């Protein structure tokens, strides 16, 4: 039980540190604030 818990904790913080490293890295763009609003115009275009 001790070794399986140790391995599971190792895997967990491995994928954890990978996740905040990509969170630092792979996000150089952020323009979500208009997103839903643009979707409104989108269906209007479709409606047209």
């Amino acid at each position: 039980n001790a070794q399986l818990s140790v391995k599971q904790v190792r895997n967990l913080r491995s994928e954890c540190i990978g996740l905040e490293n990509q969170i630092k890295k792979m996000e150089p763009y952020d323009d979500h604030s208009n997103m839903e609003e643009k979707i409104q115009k989108v269906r209007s275009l479709w409606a047209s």
């Binding site: 763009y29 323009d31 979500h32 997103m35 979707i39 989108v42 275009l45 047209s48």
Partner: protein, 52 residues
């Protein structure tokens, strides 16, 4: 990110048509009225001419 990309792509697919669409549909309505008139003004009941 991917949803914004595909949404942006369909924005440039959809945007230029909306400005021309109003003029296009009005002139299509007028020309379809003209087509209705010219279809409604073709009398065809004749043979090789006798009299007039």
């Amino acid at each position: 990110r991917e949803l914004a990309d595909v949404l942006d792509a369909q924005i440039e697919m959809l945007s230029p048509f909306e400005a021309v669409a109003t003029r296009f549909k009005e002139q299509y309505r007028t020309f379809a009225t003209a087509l209705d008139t010219t279809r409604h003004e073709l009398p065809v009941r004749s043979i090789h001419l006798e009299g007039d």
